[PDB]
Amino acid sequence: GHMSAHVQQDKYETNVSYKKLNQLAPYFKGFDGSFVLYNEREQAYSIYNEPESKQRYSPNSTYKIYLALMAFDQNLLSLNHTEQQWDKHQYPFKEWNQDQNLNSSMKYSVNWYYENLNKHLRQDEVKSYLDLIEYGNEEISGNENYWNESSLKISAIEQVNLLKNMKQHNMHFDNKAIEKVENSMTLKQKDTYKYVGKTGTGIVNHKEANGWFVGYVETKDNTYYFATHLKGEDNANGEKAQQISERILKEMELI
Ligand SMILES: CC1(C)S[C@H]([C@@H](C=O)NC(=O)Cc2ccccc2)N[C@H]1C(=O)O
Numbered sequence: 168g169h170m171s172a173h174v175q176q177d178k179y180e181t182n183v184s185y186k187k188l189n190q191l192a193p194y195f196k197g198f199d200g201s202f203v204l205y206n207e208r209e210q211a212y213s214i215y216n217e218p219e220s221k222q223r224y225s226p227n228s229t230y231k232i233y234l235a236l237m238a239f240d241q242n243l244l245s246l247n248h249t250e251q252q253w254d255k256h257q258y259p260f261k262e263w264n265q266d267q268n269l270n271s272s273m274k275y276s277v278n279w280y281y282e283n284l285n286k287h288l289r290q291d292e293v294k295s296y297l298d299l300i301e302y303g304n305e306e307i308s309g310n311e312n313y314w315n316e317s318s319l320k321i322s323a324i325e326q327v328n329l330l331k332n333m334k335q336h337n338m339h340f341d342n343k344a345i346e347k348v349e350n351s352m353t354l355k356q357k358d359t360y361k362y363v364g365k366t367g368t369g370i371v372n373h374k375e376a377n378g379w380f381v382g383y384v385e386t387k388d389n390t391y392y393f394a395t396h397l398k399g400e401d402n403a404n405g406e407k408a409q410q411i412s413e414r415i416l417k418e419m420e421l422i
Pocket residue numbers: 226227228229275276278315366367368369370404405406
């Protein structure tokens with residue numbers, strides 16, 4: 168068999184049409200970055216950096232969205248049962264050093280909460296889910312934490328497709344599971360919009376080398392799904408990805 172199979176698995180192949188967003192380049196100074204927007208009503212993609220929008224990268228903590236949905240679907244989590252007790256292990260982030268529910272664990276990106284979830288899910292069940300939802304390369308061979316700078320990788324465009332599929336009820340997850348998960352990542356809720364999203368950060372060679380912020384803005388007549396990805400030697404993290412996203416979104420007058 169050919170190595171090329173593996174190279175081709177590292178990229179999402181689509182020839183979807185898109186509006187070019189090359190004027191967004193200044194926002195990504197210092198990074199190889201990408202921004203993907205999908206306008207639900209107009210059924211239209213807009214993209215800055217198409218090549219980077221199709222490169223698959225470890226999802227890191229953005230994977231927690233689907234890990235939670237999987238857990239609801241397996242009845243590991245339920246609508247009134249999202250609490251996990253802290254094992255008394257001291258982490259460098261104090262918010263991690265306490266009992267959690269779905270809301271706090273997503274807000275504070277509490278790794279151990281989601282590791283526990285993955286621990287209780289059958290590896291072959293997870294593989295089945297990743298096949299169903301078409302999660303990037305679907306590669307969980309890597310470690311035990313296959314979603315953290317490991318085997319599993321996904322592109323910005325796919326990140327956007329998955330959020331859209333989730334919201335348009337194209338996934339087989341219960342609507343109330345989706346509502347719980349959306350609430351856990353709801354950043355802002357006003358009369359005129361709901362703003363939802365999740366950061367991710369990956370460390371490679373002791374540096375912040377992989378940053379994500381993915382989510383959507385739901386208005387009174389439309390939904391705008393987005394993914395921002397940053398690749399850099401250092402300073403490529405979720406917070407910077409979110410900052411950039413919010414500048415772009417404000418500029419587009421969505422938030
Ligand atoms: C809050 C985090 C920095 S930790 C968590 C997870 C997921 O990506 N990332 C990591 O475990 C890698 C990491 C650990 C410590 C500092 C930076 C990245 N999520 C990060 C985020 O939301 O940006």
